[PDB]
Design an enzyme around this catalytic site. Structure first.
Site, short mmCIF file in Angstrom:
data_model
loop_
_atom_site.label_atom_id
_atom_site.label_comp_id
_atom_site.label_asym_id
_atom_site.label_seq_id
_atom_site.Cartn_x
_atom_site.Cartn_y
_atom_site.Cartn_z
N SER A 1 -0.31 -34.07 -70.75
CA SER A 1 -0.03 -33.93 -69.32
C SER A 1 0.66 -35.21 -68.88
O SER A 1 0.59 -36.23 -69.57
CB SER A 1 -1.31 -33.70 -68.51
OG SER A 1 -1.19 -34.20 -67.19
N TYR B 1 -10.55 -36.15 -66.58
CA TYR B 1 -9.37 -35.48 -67.13
C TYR B 1 -8.29 -36.49 -67.50
O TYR B 1 -7.70 -36.41 -68.58
CB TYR B 1 -8.89 -34.46 -66.10
CG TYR B 1 -7.56 -33.80 -66.36
CD1 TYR B 1 -7.46 -32.69 -67.19
CD2 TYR B 1 -6.41 -34.27 -65.74
CE1 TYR B 1 -6.25 -32.08 -67.41
CE2 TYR B 1 -5.20 -33.67 -65.95
CZ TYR B 1 -5.12 -32.59 -66.78
OH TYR B 1 -3.88 -32.01 -66.97
#
Lengths: 239, 244, 241, 243
Positions: free
Chosen positions: B142, B155
């Site tokens: 990401s 995360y």
């Protein structure tokens, strides 16, 4: 029929880019500094793919005038959808006694010229209204220094920052701007054990990524420096 | 058919994983598909994959209980008979304020977002080494492998972790001709002007990630390894001065 | 009002150097030890000669979350916390292809899971006190570049790097500044000894502690979310070096 | 022995803050000014209150290489140079698509060409002196992330970050350490005034000068080749940052 212009495509990475983009259906513009015969050979092979291929002399050492050849080349081809700002030769010179004229000469050809060429291409891309792609060929030395090559390092870094600014300002015109940062490119297995993959790269291993950046599938990629280096950046004094 | 390569894409029942699985099938890979709870979506991806003249096999993968849950990767490999490509595809993002996050949630996010990818990667790499023909491993991370996502510290840390592992695997597996890279998506839709905070002003499509993943599995990517390739419509360019 | 700094694993090495230099700076000191309590008491005795209060406590971040509760007791003893330094424990190597899952998890437990829980506890107090704070995570150059044969260590250092950025964003409203200090090769008890590094030697623990102390100082009040690399040029050396 | 710090553009802002803090730390100070000789002399007078020498000189970084000779004359007056702080001039905005070439060149001239020539001179003296030194390049967060409508500024700051790495590698054998300090938004003569920045305010000049002063100190002896970002979290704010 879209048009791709690759600077300094008489040889090396530039030639491989121009040939692969011709294979992919782009009409081709080829610029040459000194070796017109090499540019003619690239043009010939590019045209063999069923594509228009035009060559022009481009010498980015006398600016801004030298960059006008990009404008003439675009006018001959009728449009421009891709510009690959391909990097010229690397020069070494000790930092401590480098003459200012040499410092300026290196910036002139390695980032000033790319800036002016990109302006010209981006202007046509905006007027056409169909977006575009601009790829700046930099180097791992956009990110990490090359010993005894401080001007070369600094100018590669500058072109990396220009890539980011162009991507941000041109996105509203659907012009995506990226850098491809090659490691050691040969221009056989185990030839350079200093590199994790232990060999230099081929011109194809660079051109293949440049071609992808011109493809429909790259439509979300902009502002990035994509490093193709056989793991060069991972090797530290520990490796 | 002795020359047919196998790609395994985790969580390919939908979203980015599905787009990767179908493009790789279209490009000529026999395909392994894993699914967490959407078995019918996994069956639909296999259906479409097989229309490209390749094999497609599905398997349930539950990365919530490790190390055992990752054995389903070994079973899928056995069914396909080999593995040449692994795509460690990213599960769903989780949010939780740092100051209050329970330890159980911190561990749960690391379990699904980097511990699983570590175990799947080991299993695939063992087969690639034994096969002796090299391979490719793509870790879907990401933009938050690089920059924080507010309210999502776990995360972010796990994506950063997966980025570090990517670099380690690339260095340690290069001798087996295994190239290891991360693809780092920005915001991908599960349109023009619909995301004004992003320079391109829209989310990405799953095809816009799958296309790069496919290139990394192609012959042209033979010199690319150890990198985090960010596909984010300019997400990383946007700083406080992007305003006004 | 006398400020309090807690430094994990300050019985030796970098953690000791930070504890002693913050002591000279006027902080009361909290010192944690895993197994060498006498080393911790030696650090406390030297810190106290600078005229500050020093306290020691056992800390074992291998059993979590309970193990991190020692930080809460240390704070209750000292009365407050203004600085937390999450120090880096020993590095362990293990081949990626063979590494058991338990070893993977063990390394993440001590190298980022523990820092996460300690940081939470210290931040909760900094918030309640209302006077801001500083948290420094000691990471490594391997927050940024891989250490061969140490994939778990590299991944966990990267993770702590991400946590640092996340903490800095979420704690800024409370005036808590969060940074990483990323050492290269550091000697624990000379020029030219490490020719592969541009400086050609490992660093001293003082050369790390000096920056940790700057990060705790008033002048550092605009610095948050960064990884400051103290490495003698390590990150500069590539195969062309 | 008395060491010498030379800070360019120390008539105001970050440069003046660096000059004053290095004067407190015991360096004789060399100050350069582009037009405000007066800010420079007020900087010198306050530096002199710390008991050190302060010398001011005009520096015309706009017409090179001759303008850089001003640094040689400064080193002559002060007797040596141990620290050089390459401090940035004013920022200029211009859209990439139509930015004139003259403006691209002027921005590079003041943002990296001048720093390159000044660092060369300073380094030659540090080598001649034989006692190492410290060179700090004041760049910007923009060394790393673009500033909209400021492509030449962004490009030139990137260039100066690259030069920083190259100088660190090339001068390390002389015990010359080279780093960049990369400030975010800095105020020139309040909480909540810059909500786009996580800390929600611009930085003070002292919040830059403090790190520059640490980089000249004994404890910074293992730090070289790095870009130290002092930005109130500017680099952490992406499209998902809010409020």
């Amino acid at each position: 029929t879209k048009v791709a212009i690759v600077t300094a495509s008489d040889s090396g990475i530039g030639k491989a880019c121009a040939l692969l983009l011709a294979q992919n259906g782009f009409d081709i513009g080829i610029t040459w500094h000194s070796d017109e015969r090499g540019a003619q050979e690239t043009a010939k092979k590019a045209a063999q793919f069923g594509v228009r291929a035009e060559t022009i002399h481009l010498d980015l050492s006398q600016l801004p005038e030298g960059a006008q050849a990009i404008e003439h080349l675009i006018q001959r081809l009728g449009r421009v959808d891709v510009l690959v700002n391909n990097a010229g030769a690397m020069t070494k010179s000790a930092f401590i006694d480098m003459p200012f004229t040499q410092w300026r000469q290196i910036f002139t050809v390695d980032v000033d010229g790319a800036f002016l060429c990109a302006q010209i291409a981006a202007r046509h891309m905006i007027k056409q209204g169909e977006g575009g792609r601009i790829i700046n060929i930099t180097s791992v030395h956009e990110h990490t220094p090359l010993p005894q090559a401080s001007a070369y390092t600094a100018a590669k870094h500058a072109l990396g920052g220009l890539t980011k600014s162009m991507a941000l300002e041109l996105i509203e015109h659907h012009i995506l701007v990226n850098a491809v940062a090659p490691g050691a490119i040969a221009t056989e297995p185990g030839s350079e054990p200093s590199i994790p993959i232990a060999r230099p790269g081929s011109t194809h291993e660079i051109a293949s990524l440049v071609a992808w950046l011109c493809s429909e599938g790259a439509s979300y990629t902009t502002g990035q420096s994509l490093i193709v280096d056989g793991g060069f950046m991972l090797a530290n004094p520990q490796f």
